[PDB]
Structures are given as structure tokens and as C-alpha cells.
Assembly symmetry: C3
Homo-oligomer: 461 residues x 3
Amino acid sequence: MNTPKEEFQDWPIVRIAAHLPDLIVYGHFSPERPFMDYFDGVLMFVDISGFTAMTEKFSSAMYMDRGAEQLVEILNYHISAIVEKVLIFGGDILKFAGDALLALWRVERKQLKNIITVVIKCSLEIHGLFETIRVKIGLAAGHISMLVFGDETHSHFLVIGQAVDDVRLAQNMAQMNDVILSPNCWQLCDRSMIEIESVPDQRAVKVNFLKPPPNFNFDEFFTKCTTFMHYYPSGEHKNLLRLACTLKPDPELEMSLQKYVMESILKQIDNKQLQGYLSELRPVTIVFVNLMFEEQDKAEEIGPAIQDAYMHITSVLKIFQGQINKVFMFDKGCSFLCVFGFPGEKVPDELTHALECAMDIFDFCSQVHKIQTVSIGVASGIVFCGIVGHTVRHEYTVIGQKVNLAARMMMYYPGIVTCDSVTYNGSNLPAYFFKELPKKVMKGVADSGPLYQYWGRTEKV
Amino acid sequence: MNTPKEEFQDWPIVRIAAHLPDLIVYGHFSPERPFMDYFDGVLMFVDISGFTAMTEKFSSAMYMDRGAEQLVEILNYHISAIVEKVLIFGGDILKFAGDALLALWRVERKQLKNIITVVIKCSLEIHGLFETIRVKIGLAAGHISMLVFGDETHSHFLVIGQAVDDVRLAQNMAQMNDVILSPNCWQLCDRSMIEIESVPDQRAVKVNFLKPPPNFNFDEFFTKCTTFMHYYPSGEHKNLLRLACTLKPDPELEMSLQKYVMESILKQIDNKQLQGYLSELRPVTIVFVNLMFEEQDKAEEIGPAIQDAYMHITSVLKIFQGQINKVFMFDKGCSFLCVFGFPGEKVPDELTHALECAMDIFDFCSQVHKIQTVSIGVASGIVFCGIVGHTVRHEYTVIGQKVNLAARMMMYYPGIVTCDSVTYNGSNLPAYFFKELPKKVMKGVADSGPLYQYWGRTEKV
Amino acid sequence: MNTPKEEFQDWPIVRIAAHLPDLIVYGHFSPERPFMDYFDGVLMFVDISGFTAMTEKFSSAMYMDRGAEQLVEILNYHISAIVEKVLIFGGDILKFAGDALLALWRVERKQLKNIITVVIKCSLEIHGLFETIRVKIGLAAGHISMLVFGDETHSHFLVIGQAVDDVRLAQNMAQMNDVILSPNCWQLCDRSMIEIESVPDQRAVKVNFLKPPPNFNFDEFFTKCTTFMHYYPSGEHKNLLRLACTLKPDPELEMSLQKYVMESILKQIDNKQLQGYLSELRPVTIVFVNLMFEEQDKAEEIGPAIQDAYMHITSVLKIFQGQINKVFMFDKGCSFLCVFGFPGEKVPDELTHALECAMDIFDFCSQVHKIQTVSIGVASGIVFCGIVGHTVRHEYTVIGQKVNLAARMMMYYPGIVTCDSVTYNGSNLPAYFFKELPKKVMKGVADSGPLYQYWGRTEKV
Ligand SMILES: O=S([O-])[O-]
Ligand SMILES: O=S([O-])[O-]
Ligand SMILES: O=S([O-])[O-]
């Protein structure tokens, strides 16, 4: 009796799970919104802005109308390598976003110390890929909250808390090729493994060297650390980068997981759209919404507020097929990256509509309990869209100078709706609906062009 | 000198052969129609109505517009496992159809006894997959006729005879998890292998246990039985589930095999249509044609009649791009499952046309020599369409309550053209073209709604 | 720590490299045009006209509208096998074209003798595939020039010189199953390896037998010959048919290589078009341009002329989306195979436009320095288009009686623009714009139909 080999199982549920972390795939939590949960872990934030800064290079005429295709190929080639390192070291890639990848090693409290060693080694081996288009790494550790929000058809998640705030602060201190540890990470780590130095005006530290004790053996140590890693591929599945590659059809699980993935990605997954259709340089309008809270580390306070904001945003976006591309925590606040124009969702008057939707969002969110400040940046132009990452772990992402610009406008012009010159000029709304703003030098931004506040239709706000 | 490994050979002829049994793939018979041939074998009929009854579940709004995709994924996951068992035990899957899969082990007469043992073991291991959405299994053995019918562009086949009648009768007696043997199967089997019980008012038996003799070794026995299995993958190809996976380009063979496969499937096979385009919940009209004969086990009588009917049906269907999805033998008669509306073949007025085509078919077939009764059921609504089965052995199939309803209408209202309320109401043909029928309780049917006879345009028929 | 296996790397750059020889893939030469380089090597020309003559068979109604699909499947099945032999013997397939495949083993001068032995063995093993739709093989050796020409967006290459002239002359002497050596090949070869015979009225020879010395071991000999083969897959990559399968993303390399590949192929490569869309029987107009030179073995003379001609041709073709499918050296001259109508590039009035473009090309090229004669053949009808060859090495190709006819018209009616009857009749240009020509018997052509000169719009040329 023959024994044929199992076939490569490429079911829709597997393909959906490539777009999600294990935190969600194996999360099994209530469908109630908001949902909050609490754990401990180590975070790694890998600043890949040096790669995504290539969007400019690839809009050159030199690329003969295949800039987007070339961009996605070269980005994925480098980002894949980072993803593989994270996964082989036992990490969960949470999100690709804010010109960064964020990864998590969730463990019980007692194991944070040893897991920090693992993550430092991983970090150093990531830097190792690119010796000779480099990255900066921040590490944090400690208490982490998770929030899941959404409605009956769509779900989003966020991780929150001081360790999350810390990991971005750490990464912002890093220079290229650095690994920076948060103060708490440094307090919790195995100091015998590493040589550090002080970072001026900061309690964060820089790892100069991982130099373990004489009798240390990393592979044996790692094996010990895998006892605490629930989903590390093992046994018959030790050849797989993710256990999620083994997922079998389960309609109730797939119904829950598809809520995290945009409809046009699901169309591709279902082989009802060409696999290359979403890689494009396309004109869009970015509406970047920032919500600041009194206290942004307290999920129990900020979770209902985000949920209420989300319900309104989604209703407003529905009317114009705008989409939410990403939600993430910034140093200050919860940010929604909304896009008007992307998977063939491109209505005419996208600009006047974008500004009107921004104002609606601004007015509603400003009256939500516990939301202290709302800030919205609106920028329009060519952006790269595509599925970025590894075959086994990837996400649809939008990258470009106008993305960056809308993000910086919402941070440098807080409490108002701002727009760029493309949007202002294109809108053909009357000019007294705007205010011309002072020029600010914004980290990452070369020549803003004139920026404007969208004051709105009436003098008396 | 290097020796690179043969590549995965995924030629069009291989892809076409996935849709056909070995009976046809390796049949090499004349292109003359009808064609009849005669052999012996063991049949297994696996009632998968418990899986296909899930079409209802998947039309819920809960499935957010991906019901068809979810349905095909979960069906294929379970049906694949059944198919693999059949193939590894040396069976030929003949058809997926009538909420069942039918499989054949063709052998010389002297080996029927030992092959029945093989098939009983297979049957028990199929039940084993689903312990903890179960199936019922009928087995028959004996003389089997095959009929191939069609024209210059299209071919269809049927297996016929008492063993075929028996295998459906056996399966209809089974409860869930049962294996029922036909009277002849029980007469021909190795009684020392099994413990049976009587089935009330029947000469069929139920297998309680396969309990072989003390010195029996199934793997050694199976190896002996493979001497008689012409196409069992072996040697260099012992890792393949089907020898047909090894087929090489051969234009004369491909011309013959493509005649069995619908044009829209061939479009997919030729990579000229997306691989997911045929998985859909779509509105159609089912026209289910049953032809009863004096004697339905005699291919030499019924073969010309079916051929003549087929020639007329196809001409009538051509005019409205209706398609024949399946042809199969029922307890009573040869049934044609015709569909109006499926691979983007959807003409307007599908309902008046469907009724007019049914009447045409009814009038012509009623005058065909040896056709004793014609019965036609017409039902319209949402049905699941898709390629169902294993990668290596699968078929386009239509599944749904309206399929079931049209099938039961043709059996419970013999000798007439009947239609459901959707069809009657939608047609906007005058009401005196119909007769409102008595309500019958039909096994498998919950609330028919009012049913109608299509009497036709004139009072005097 | 797990070690997952590298995935099958199917990047766009790899897929582009399948369409090109190693000569270009690893060429790294200046982007300046024309570019010329000089080397030595052995050439093999494999006449596959016996396969491509099947286009006629596959336009039969017997193939039910899948002639093109069946043709490409059967062609690729046989041509793949030839390609694998060439590659495993260390050859570089340069082009698929002129009903032939051309391959090159580039080596330093001192190794030509031993490499000829390798190529003769390869040739004999190619014939071996088809014992029991056969091929003819010519071999040449010696000095070879390469020319690369084009503009900022498109590139083409040619190999030139007496060895190239020789390899076609050798192949034209061959009968089926023959291997014919050019005079220089025979002068340079290891005469102890082979038994030859004279070819009447020729200094070329026919290989009767490869009968090496008593102590000869081909595998050991081949291993020695691989020292001189720069890109022979080896070591960790000894399982690959081409090193080019290992190419990694590199935007500057991909920008250079995509210039050799038509835009519609790049669309497929980018998964923005179905993989089967370019296999078709379609009506087109072939415009076959031949340019003859005083001295066609001297790249330094003919290279600027070809470049100047190319610049004009491309400008003329642009206006009507005509494409250049192939450029190659014929016994006499440089030929451009231009096509009007192929990857959905089909403008109305294709015929009057084709004739007007031919005349433009004829008038311009006739005034180019060093171009001695221009001849253009114009023929219109159904042709097979598709990607032909092996997965790892293949090219878009057009095949058909009208291709053949336009090629023979340009050779048998030199110095003029000629067209077939389909073109003349269809154009609805006045009849005095043409001259009806004497009938010539053209090798390969059965019934021309009447042929015409396109004299043009005025009496006085
Ligand atoms: O989920 S992280 O963007 O706050
Ligand atoms: O071929 S079986 O449906 O009678
Ligand atoms: O490149 S060969 O056609 O002269």
C-alpha cells in the first residue's frame, strides 16, 4: 500500500494567516469590542526607513514603468531576510508599519531575562545581514496590553503600554547599526552577557557587545528557551518557519481571521484577482488621524475611546471607500492611516471628500470621552502600495513621501486638520475655507511646500 | 555531467485527466456513439449528503460574501481525505454526483472475492476519518456495463447494470457510519473475513466487523491484490496517488479527453481564467431530466435511446447556453442534470426559456424508442458551483437545496414537467400554462413551496 | 534553532533571465549602442522546422478551438528535452528563431578542440531523443562577434561572423538525423574521435560516428572540460539547469535585462496578466526586413548600420504598435521579424499601415551607409504566438506559414517590398500602387498565391 507525501497545503485559511501574527492567529478571544488582554514580553522595533526611503529612486523614468514591481521585489528580498531571522529566533512579527517592523516574544515574567538575551542575539544577527540600507533596532521589555477593536465585519489590534512607548523611544535614539535597550529592558536583562554604554541624557543604553561567559553555548541556551515558546515549530514541523503554515480549514476560525484583512487582499487569496495586481504606484490621498489621551498606557481607559472613534471613522470612510491601512501607537497617541484611492477604490473628487471626511472625523473624535486632542494630516500624491514581507508573513503597506508628510503634519500641527498644497489646490473649495500655516522644519521632511489648515466652511467654528 | 531532477510536470493533459477516472483516461475505445463495454468489478458509493447539506449554513450573512470560497475549502478538505483513501486502496473514482462519490475496482471475475475484502477495509478506514459530518457506504459487486455517448465535441459516460442499481439501494439502506453490502456482494465475498447482520426486509447485509483469520496480514494481502490492479502507482511512481499524474503530451489523447470537460474548466486549465473564478454562489435554473426504460440494466437497449435523447438535449441546450453538469443512473432511470446560468453563461429570461426547453426535451424524449417515461423537474435559486475533490481527482459540481428539489420533483411527479414557485412566478407566462399540484412529502425536502406542472401553451396537449 | 530550507526563489529577475542567454545575463557590458565584442566558440544550430511545421495540423477544426494551447504543449514537451540536453552539456541557448534553436559554447581558443567533442556528443544525444519529428544539426567553430543594439528602453543582440554564416550553411546541407560540421569545425576538431564522410560539392563533412579511443571515458573528459565553462552549475547548485536560476534581486541588473523582453511578457512576469494569455492563434501581418551588407562578417562595419536602421524601424513601428519579434543573421543579411497585431496590440487598417511602414523602412534603410540592399516581405494570416522552450529557457515566438512566406519573399525578391494576396486584396489601396510579380518556386513554400510588389503611391519612385 503506497504512502504518498502530504501535499503543500495552501488553503485560504493559511494564506489569510500570513497577514497576521500568532497573537491573533492563535488568540481565540471573545468577539466583543473592545477586547483587552495583558501579558509580558520583549519587543523589537526594526527601523527600516532606510529601505522604504527607496520609493523616490523607483519613481524615476529610469525604471520604465516597472518601478512598483522593482520596488516590491527589492524590498521583499531584504525584508524577507529580517523576517526569517525573527521567526527562527522565536519571535512573532506583529506589524509592518510606520517604516518599521515590530516583533514580540511573549513569555512569562520569570523568563524575560533569558529571552532578552535571545532577542539581543537576534538583533545582532539582523545587523549582520547588512554589513557591506542598514537598520536601527530598539528593544523594550515588560508589561504589554493588547487591544482588539472593530465591528461585526472588521477587526484591528494594537499593543499598548510603557514597553511599547519605550521601544519606539529606544529606536529613535539609535543610529544606524545600533541596538538600544529601554531602561526597563536594561534593568531586567542578564548584564553578564553584554557590554553597554550610556546614551547621553537618557537612561536607555546601547549594546556594544554580546560577550557571554566562557562556558556559554547559545544553541543549548536557545533550546532551553524554547520550552517557553508555545508555537515554535518543532518535531515533524521543525522545517517550517511558522506553525501557522499548518493551519487546516476551520470556517469559524477563518471567519474571525478574515476580519483583519482588506477585501481586495481576500480577493487575491481566493484566486479571483491576479497575484500582482496590488503592487502599484498610484495616486492617493492619505488621511492620518492621531488621537491623544491623558494616559496612553492604560488600555482600560483608552480602549473604549478607540472603539468609539473607530466606529465613527469606519462609517465616514464607508461613504467614500476610504480604507484604514494601519493603526498603531506613536510616541504620542493612537494613529489611523486612512487612504482614499487604493485597490481600485478610486472615487472622483477624492480631495474635497477627503477634507470633508477629515473634518467629520475631527469633530466627532474631539467629543469622545478621554480623547484629549485630535490631529489630522492630509497629503496627496503618488505612493507605493503592495504586499510587503516574507511569503509566510507579510502585510499590505503604503509607503511614500506623502505618507511621511501626513504623519509629520499631524504631529507638528497638533489639534487641527492640516493639508498639503496638492490637496488645497486640487480641492477647488474656496480659499477662505483654509488658513496658510507657518513653515515648520519637520524631521524626515524635505521641502513641505506651503501647508494649510482646513478651517472649514464657516468662520465661527 | 549534472543530473537535474525532473520538474513537476503540470501539462494541460495532466490537468484535464484530474477531471476523469482511469476508466476513461486509459480506456482507448472507439469514438463511435453509443459505445458499450462490459466487465466485472466492485463498486463503492459514499453518501456525502451530510457535507453537501452545508450549502445552507454558508449562505448565511455571517460568511460576509465569502460563503462559496469557505464552502469549497471545507468540502475539499474532507472530500480530499476520502479520495486519498480510495486511491491508496487501488480504486478509481468514477464520479462526484448525486451528493455521493462513486468508485470502482475493476477486476477479473476470479478476483472479486479478494477485492471485496480490500474495499471493505477501505470503507472502514473512510468511516475512521470522521469519528468525532459522517458518511454512509454501500458496496456492490458483479457485472458492470459502461456506456459512452455524445457527439463530435462532447462525451459523457455512465456505468449501468444490477451492481450499479444495487450500490445505490445498499447505500439508501445504510444509516450513518454503516457499510452495507448488496446481496450479490455478500454472496461473492470472503465470509471468513467479516461479521454481518441482517437488514430487515432485505437480502443486503450490514458489516459489523472485519475480523480476519489469525494468520492474516493485510499489507501482504494487499500486495497480492495489486497484481490485478493495472494502474496502481508502482516502482519509480510509488509516491504518486495516480498514474495519470505521469501523462505526457499527446494531442490525439487530449482531443479525446477534453470532450468530457466543460469549456470554462478548459479555460482555467489553459491559464486563461483565474483559478478561483468558478467557485461561486450563483442564481441558476436546474432542469433535471429523468428517462426511465423497460429494462435499465441492458446497455444494448438503453444505449441508443440515451444517445438519441442526448443529441436532442444538447441541441436544445445549445440555443440557451444551458449545460449538462452531470449524467447518472438513479434507482429508476438515466438523469441529466442541466443548468441554465453557470460559468458566465447567464442569458436573460432564463425562466421562460428553461420551461420551454424542458417541454421541448419532454416532447422529443417521450417519442424515443425504448424510453418508457420522461420526467422533468425545474427549480431555480442560489446554488454552490465549484470544482470539488482532490488536486489529483476532482470535478465541477453544483450543490444546493434547489438541486435536491428538482431531483425529487422528477421522481415524485413522474411523467410530467414540474417547476417550483420561483420559476412559475418569475416566468410571467400566463397562469393557465400551469397546473397547481398536490403537495407530496419528499424525502430530503423541507417545505417545497407550491409546485406546478408546466402544462404548456395549449389546453389540448 | 531551526534551519528551514531556502524557498523556491521565483523573483521577477529570475523570470526575466529565462528569456535570455548567459551571454547577456552575465555580460555586464556598456549601455552604449552599438556595442561589439569578440570571442571564440562552438555553435550548434538545431533545425526544428519539422516541429514548427505542425502549425497547420493545429489549425484544423478537429482541435476544437484549443489548437494554440495544444500546439504550445506538444512543442514545449519536445523542445524542452532538446534544451535540457544543451544545458546539461554546458551550452548557452542564444535564441529560438528562424525555425531553429541556436546554442553556443564560448571558450578560449585552445579549448575549441575538446569542446567540439562535447558538442558532437550532445548533437548525437539530441538525435537520440527522437529515434522512433526529427531534427537536423549543423556545427561550426571559430571566431564569433557579438553586437548589441538598441535605444534607451529596448535592446537586441546578434552574433555575427564566418562561424555564424557557417553554422547555417552546415545545417542547410544536413538531411534529417545528420550532424554536419563546418569546414573550420572539421579543421579544428579531434579527428581521432570521429568517423566522417564527404558532402558532395562542399568542404563541410558529415559525422557518421563518434568512436573515441579505447581508454576514453566521456564523463571524466567532460569534467575536465567544465574547467573552462564559467557558469556550469556546480557544488551546492549542481541540481540546477542554469546558474541564472540563482539570480537575486538587483534593480540595476533588472533594468538592463528587461530591455530585451517585450512589455506584454513583462506583464505576465509581474503577475498582471494570465500565464496563458500569450498562447494564441491570431491574425497578424508579418513584415520581414532584410538588410544586406558588402561584408556581413565585420561587426565594426555592420554594427553602426544596424543600429541606425534599428533606430528608424523602432520609430516607424511605434506609430502602429508593431513589434520586433526577432532579429537574426540569415545566409545573407540581418533580418528583422516585425509583427503588426500580437499581444493585444491590434490596430484597425493593419494592412495599409503595414505596407506604408514597410515602404518607409525600405526608403530610409536604403540610404544608410554600408547597407547594400534592403528587401522586405509582407504576409498576413493566422499565426501561432506563444512562449516556446523550457521553463528555465524560453522565448516568445511566432510560427506559421505566413511567417515562412514573408521570409522567403524577402530572399527570393531582393531589393523590393513584396506582399502576399491577403495583404494586397485587403488593403483597398488602389491597384496601380502594386505590380503583379512572376511566380518563383520558393524552398519551403507550397502555393504562394499571386505575389505583388508594393511599388508605392507614385509612378516615378
Ligand atoms: O500595535 S502597535 O502599533 O501600538
Ligand atoms: O455512471 S453512474 O451515474 O450510472
Ligand atoms: O544572433 S544570430 O541570429 O545572428
